[PDB]
Design a protein around this ligand. Structure first.
Ligand SMILES: Nc1nc2c(ncn2[C@@H]2O[C@H](COP(=O)(O)OP(=O)(O)O)[C@@H](O)[C@H]2O)c(=O)[nH]1
Ligand SMILES: [Ca+2]
Ligand code: NA
Length: 156
């Protein structure tokens, strides 16, 4: 089956690990060593196509990434501001302005939202990529986030 090399990036504490573990292990991790950077495998069916996801969970194989999740936390304006810095890195590492990518706004279950949906959507539109609100806690949008990225790779 087709192997998709996915990579999760973003500021520290946005939920990169929590999203990866929730997708794969199907549980919400209370805490994850911020210094652990490793890849995790996951067999999955997307639109009737079975495939293996090789998900590199980065910590603050990178270059071989076929698709990237740019994650920020909706209760963290700084992490949202950091997004551009991460997208530009991916552009340079892949030597391409058109890399498969999705903007993820995590922790959408928290009431202390400081980054509006409209604000995040506009940024996604400026990048020409999909935007997806997620919660590693409740599982909202988690599958959709990774699956949409696979779909973006298929287009490319
Ligand atoms: N409420 C809430 N907390 C989250 C969510 N995702 C991650 N966290 C918390 O944020 C902290 C750091 O998450 P982590 O996965 O390590 O983010 P990372 O540093 O980018 O890998 C942990 O204490 C998690 O419990 C979420 O969707 N909702
Ligand atoms: Ca982590
Ligand atoms: Na790293």
């Amino acid at each position: 089956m087709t192997e998709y090399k996915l990579v999760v990036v973003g500021a520290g504490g946005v939920g990169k690990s929590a999203l990866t573990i929730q997708l794969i292990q199907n549980h919400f991790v209370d805490e994850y060593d911020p210094t652990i950077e490793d890849s995790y495998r996951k067999q999955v069916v997307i639109d009737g196509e079975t495939c293996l996801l090789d998900i590199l969970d980065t910590a603050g194989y990178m270059r071989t990434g076929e698709g990237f999740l740019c994650v920020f936390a909706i209760n963290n304006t700084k992490s949202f501001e950091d997004i551009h810095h991460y997208r530009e890195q991916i552009k340079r590492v892949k030597d391409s302005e058109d890399v498969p990518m999705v903007l993820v706004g995590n922790k959408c279950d928290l009431p202390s939202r400081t980054v509006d949906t409209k604000q995040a959507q506009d940024l996604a539109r400026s990048y020409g990529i999909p935007f997806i609100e997620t919660s590693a806690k409740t599982r909202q949008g988690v599958d959709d986030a990774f699956y949409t990225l696979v779909r973006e790779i298929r287009k490319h």
